[PDB]
Amino acid sequence: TKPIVFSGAQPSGELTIGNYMGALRQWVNMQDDYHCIYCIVDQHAITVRQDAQKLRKATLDTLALYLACGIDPEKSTIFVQSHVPEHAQLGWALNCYTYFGELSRMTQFKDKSARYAENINAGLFDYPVLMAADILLYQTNLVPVGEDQKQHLELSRDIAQRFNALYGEIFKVPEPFIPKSGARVMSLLEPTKKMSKSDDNRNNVIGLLEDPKSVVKKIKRAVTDSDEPPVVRYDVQNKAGVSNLLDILSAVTGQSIPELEKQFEGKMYGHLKGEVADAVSGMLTELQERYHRFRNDEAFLQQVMKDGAEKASAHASRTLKAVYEAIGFVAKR
Amino acid sequence: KPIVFSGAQPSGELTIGNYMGALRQWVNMQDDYHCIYCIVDQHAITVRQDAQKLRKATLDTLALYLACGIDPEKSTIFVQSHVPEHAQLGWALNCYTYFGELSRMAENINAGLFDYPVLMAADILLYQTNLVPVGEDQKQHLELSRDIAQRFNALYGEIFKVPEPFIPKARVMSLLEPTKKMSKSDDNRNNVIGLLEDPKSVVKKIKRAVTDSDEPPVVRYDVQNKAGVSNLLDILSAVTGQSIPELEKQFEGKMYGHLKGEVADAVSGMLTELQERYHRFRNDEAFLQQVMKDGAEKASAHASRTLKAVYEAIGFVAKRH
Ligand SMILES: Nc1ncnc2c1ncn2[C@@H]1O[C@H](COP(=O)(O)OC(=O)[C@@H](N)Cc2c[nH]c3ccccc23)[C@@H](O)[C@H]1O
Ligand SMILES: Nc1ncnc2c1c(-c1ccc(Oc3ccccc3)cc1)nn2C1CCNCC1
Ligand SMILES: O=c1[nH]c2cc(Cl)ccc2o1
DSSP states (O other), X not given: OOOEEEEEEOSSSOOBHHHIIIIIHHHHHTTTXXXXXXEEOHHHHTTSOOOHHHHHHHHHHHHHHHHHHTXXXXXXXXXXXXXXXXXXXXXXXXXXXXXXXXXXXXHHHHHHHHHOGGGOBHHHHHHHHHHHHHHXXXXXXXXXXXGGGHHHHHHHHHHHHHHHHHHOSOSOOOEEEXXXXXTTOBOSSOTTSBOOTTOSOGGGOOXXXXXXXXXXXXXXXXXXXXXXXXXXXXXXXXXXXXXXXXXXXXXXXXXXXXXXXXXTTTOOHHHHHHHHHHHHHHHHHHHHHHHHHHHTOHHHHHHHHHHHHHHHHHHHHXXXXXXXXXXXXXXXX | OOEEEEEEOSSSOOBHHHIIIIIHHHHTTTTTSEEEEEEOHHHHTTSXXXXXHHHHHHHHHHHHHHHHTOOTTTSEEEEGGGOTHHHHHHHHHHTTSBHHHHHTOOTTSBHXXXXXXXXXXXXXXXXXXXXXXXXXXXXXXXXHXXXXXXXXXXXXXXXXXXOEEOOOOXXXXXXXXXXXXXXXXXXXXXXXOXXXXXXXXXXXXXXXXXXXOOSSOOOOOOTTTOHHXXXXXXXXXXXXXXXXXXXXXXXXXOOHHHHHHHHHHHHHHHHHHHHHHHHHHHTOHHHHHHHHHHHHHHHHHHXXXXXXXXXXXXXXXXXXX
């Protein structure tokens, strides 16, 4: 049996080139090498208040975007989190093996709490426990995420180790898979801030489903620096915007930063932004063409969700039965 | 017919205070209400305990409720962990519960100890529950369940019933501290009589029961001045159905030794029949397995209806069977 890959994305906001380079790109590339399981985490999405029609549409948008990126339902398991009850069941059990202080110290809870002061809910606080359940159910070996999820992944490793120390080899201890390029794509007008899929200023983001003409304009207005002469060189501290543009270009083309710096010797930010705009515009045009063919095929989306929940439930039920036996529950008949 | 929900915590040996004080009366109301008894093993694990002891205590609790007269054909009795909808609704309700509400109910407590009030709200709201018999320690918890139900209903429509406490209330006090209610969660086991205690144990515990220094000894009801004698009278009245004034007449010119002898005989007479049924049920694995299977099937059919309405209101894509 192949080692197992698991990862998820929220059907909230609009997925960006950041979500693609930090996660989805690795998801597509891992499908033959490993046994891959990819989840649309609708139960995590509702830790921020959603409109019911927007959430349902966004769940199906996210599924079609996975397929458009090249996630192949003949190679990978693709499913909607709420379709597998074992996620919530194991999540409750793992609350009892997680410390309050491990949750209160989380960067995501602190940032989200500041943004949504009127909805500091228990789900937002308990977010990392459900995510540990998502990973540990599938005997997961590798979790491809961006840098912002590292703290969450480290807690899932601590929970797995703590539970195993008491009860035996119930869980695998998962490892993060974080890319060398594109692990933390930054905002186009505030390159010290991560690119957000829920930004109130749309000019900060490159949306995967945004009009490529709109995206090219945003790239040309991306902030650079006051260097005289202008020089294309990677330096996050002193050249955050130029560095972020180089990181996006490297991630799209596969070229190294040193190769890009050599290609741009004697050139300035017009050549850099021209190449980033051309590469991103081409990628999004091809991606969106595949997207509409999947998004408007409800029979195919329905079949992928049915087959994926059936495959996930088989794995998850096996792990949950072992967890329930270990902690001392009377087994269900 | 109103729906009543009770959570039976597996750990802790039920006492004569639990039986004569509430369970005995609820056994006789199984035709008046749709009663649901949930053995709450998912609540249990907020406290680290031996796994084999928790499994045994779940089956001990099931067999004792059956022995006291809960009829699995009239009432729904089941193990919480056998119905996944409890955990599913609990997560959803976390997203509609303020962190501040749980704080107002440290770095080293487990998240289950912080979050169980949300699981209790899910347990109740799943079954369109009208009535919850709560202890005084659980009144704030029931108020949170009502607050969550009203908050969700105000956003999405009348998805949940707003549950009410069961207001109406036998007095059974601690044998060595007659000002404190007899409690199944007590550390001084000499303060309680468990439902499974043998006649020799019952005699020993009643004989140490605190009385007073009245001279002559007088068997009369007076909670202020004769708390221990009053408690023995209340226990004897609750077992036999004889009135306090009738018992006062019966023990005129009698000493506290006579009262204690009659209390022990009355209590052990009541427990013998409970204990026969308990050992019969507890050692019948196929009977207990069939009760749990039937109960979880009944509970899941009702719980699935509520959870589907909750998921539709939130906007989740419906599962593909
Ligand atoms: N600007 C950025 N640059 C690079 N990568 C980025 C950027 N912004 C986001 N990411 C990554 O995108 C993935 C999905 O993000 P979500 O917010 O949907 O999704 C999240 O933040 C998860 N909690 C969802 C989840 C729930 N359960 C799981 C179990 C395993 C893995 C993931 C999950 C993530 O990998 C995230 O790191
Ligand atoms: N799980 C726990 N872990 C720690 N402390 C807890 C609890 C609970 C608890 C347990 C089970 C439960 O089941 C129901 C469900 C529905 C209806 C009725 C009962 C409800 C609550 N109560 N408390 C106490 C501690 C002292 N008194 C204050 C609260
Ligand atoms: O991760 C989690 N936390 C949870 C809390 C409740 Cl009440 C139920 C399921 C859960 O899963």
